[PDB]
């Protein structure tokens, strides 16, 4: 599923990301745009044999199990397929495990380089939330 | 190297006077960070109009692409910085540049509902029918987000 911005903002709000570890909602919407272009089915193969899955491009070495990645840790204790659902619940729950404190969104290099410090309020404006 | 790193940091941070001294002292106006950002990308991203102009007057590369193909115009359009959008276009920015995701600046402005920027891009030759990676035009994006005002602009084009 390809979300629109306001549709994704509403879903991320529904799943409790607003102010999660102190990060206002627009941070997560911004991160999703840069990571996946709002596409829940986004996948990216990495040279290290892992793959990034879903709307937040969560990695199969550290976070989810895809059964083909050497050195799997599976810290979210989830099959990576759950991260390709049209329902963002599993991606949100894994993102919540990745972000364990107020610097955890550094888990996304694109968020650090393109969202942090910007007007994240704009990402949730106009959405009738 | 040293000064280029400091220039990138000063441009991102909006440190106009530090940008000025670093340029006077020989910093590379097109220094890259690990993400492939130049100082112009970072000043455009963060809305620092005066730094954008200083960089451009020192020969900044107006169409530099970062590691994901975004140009300074992409970042300024997404972040609602109208005056920066105008100066970048004045200095030769490609109004129809496609990043690696397949977005043009018009797509990015439409996602965010930046009405005035949409109008500037169109006036400067943006392709109103350009489709993103998923076949969406700016109009489709505006309908997606229930943005009546933006839809009204693009519907008649």
UniProtKB/Swiss-Prot annotation, chain A:
Give GO cellular component annotations, separated by semicolons.
Answer: cytoplasm; endoplasmic reticulum; extracellular space
Active site, UniProt feature: 35, 52
Q: Output the Gene3D superfamilies linked to this UniProt entry.
A: 1.10.530.10
- Binding partners and assembly: Monomer.
The EC number on file is: 3.2.1.17
Where found, per UniProt?
A: Secreted
Tissue specificity note: In the egg white and polymorphonuclear leukocytes.
Keyword Signal among record annotations: yes
Chain ranges of the C-type lysozyme domain? 1-129
Instruction: Kindly state which reaction or reactions the protein catalyses.
Output: Hydrolysis of (1->4)-beta-linkages between N-acetylmuramic acid and N-acetyl-D-glucosamine residues in a peptidoglycan and between N-acetyl-D-glucosamine residues in chitodextrins
Designated gene of the protein: LYZ
Q: Which cysteines are joined by disulfide bonds?
A: 6-127, 30-115, 64-80, 76-94
So which domain of life are we looking at? Eukaryota
- Matches recorded under PANTHER family: LYSOZYME C (PTHR11407:SF28)
Q: Which GO terms describe its biological process?
A: cell wall macromolecule catabolic process; defense response to bacterium; defense response to Gram-negative bacterium; defense response to Gram-positive bacterium; killing of cells of another organism
User: What Pfam family does this protein match (any one)?
Assistant: Lys
Which InterPro entries does this chain map to? Glyco_hydro_22, Glyco_hydro_22_CS, Glyco_hydro_22_lys, Lysozyme-like_dom_sf
What name does UniProt use for this protein? Lysozyme C
The protein's GO terms of the molecular function aspect are: beta-N-acetylglucosaminidase activity; identical protein binding; lysozyme activity
What family is this protein classified in?
A: Belongs to the glycosyl hydrolase 22 family.
Q: What else is known?
A: Lysozyme C is capable of both hydrolysis and transglycosylation; it also shows a slight esterase activity. It acts rapidly on both peptide-substituted and unsubstituted peptidoglycan, and slowly on chitin oligosaccharides.
